[PDB]
Amino acid sequence: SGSSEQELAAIVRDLGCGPYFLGTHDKRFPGFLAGNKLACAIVNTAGRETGGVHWLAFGWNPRSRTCYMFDPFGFSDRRLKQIYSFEYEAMLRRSALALSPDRCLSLEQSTQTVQGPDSAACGLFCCMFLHAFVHWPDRPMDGNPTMNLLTGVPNGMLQSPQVLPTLRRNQEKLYRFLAHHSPYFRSHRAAIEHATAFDKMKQL
Amino acid sequence: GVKSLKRRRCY
Numbered sequence A: 001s002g003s004s005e006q007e008l009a010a011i012v013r014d015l016g017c018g019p020y021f022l023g024t025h026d027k028r029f030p031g032f033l034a035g036n037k038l039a040c041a042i043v044n045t046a047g048r049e050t051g052g053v054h055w056l057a058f059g060w061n062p063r064s065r066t067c068y069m070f071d072p073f074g075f076s077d078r079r080l081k082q083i084y085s086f087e088y089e090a091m092l093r094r095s096a097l098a099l100s101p102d103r104c105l106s107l108e109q110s111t112q113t114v115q116g117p118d119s120a121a122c123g124l125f126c127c128m129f130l131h132a133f134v135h136w137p138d139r140p141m142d143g144n145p146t147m148n149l150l151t152g153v154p155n156g157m158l159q160s161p162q163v164l165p166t167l168r169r170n171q172e173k174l175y176r177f178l179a180h181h182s183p184y185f186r187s188h189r190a191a192i193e194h195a196t197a198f199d200k201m202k203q204l
Numbered sequence B: 001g002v003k004s005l006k007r008r009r010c011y
């Protein structure tokens, strides 16, 4: 169910993220502490011991002092804390203290889902976002060749019928994008598309 | 793409 950390590490590398990528972690990701460089990561909502639950993408732009948090589902921090028991306040504090002279940062996050409610492609959408983030770090969420390929829908509409055709088309365009840019995705395509299926949570 | 919300956080 979903993408493994090796799967994501290989795809992220294939996407041209490697030099700016800090790895794949669990909820205990410390933050952007090393230096004031373009940096990103893939962080799980849960601790490694639980086995993993959901994937999130975190980016740092030093020329705007912005931390981008990408939840493919566009849940608010309040909803992330409720649904997934995930909080990243300490992460934001450690980061702004380590990299911001004024001790302030801008937290930019999605309010729209790109993912169907039963889909297990969260890790893969995180890869796509990090591709958009490393190529357009000043505006990674939308208005760039990579995120222009997807159609975000208000998060509040996640469980509604009118949006499944859009959320499925997103998932098909996700695969097509990854097959175009990642040899690792191409090689493991059948196992990746099946384990991250649009309907995977119903097919447990 | 997705619509976003930008918030300033100071520590």
Ligand SMILES: *C(=N)c1nccc(CNC(=O)[C@@H](NC(=O)[C@@H](c2cc(Cl)cc(Cl)c2)N(C)C)[C@@H](C)CC)n1
Pocket: A001, A002, A003, A004, A005, A006, A024, A025, A026, A027, A044, A045, A046, A047, A048, A049, A050, A051, A052, A053, A054, A055, A119, A120, A121, A122, A123
């Ligand atoms: C996306 N919608 C979605 N759907 C179902 C499951 C998941 C999350 N998948 C995982 O977390 C994987 N787990 C691991 O890769 C690994 C792990 C690694 C790291 Cl760096 C952190 C954590 Cl918390 C977990 N496990 C094996 C320890 C799946 C392959 C297993 C559920 N996302």
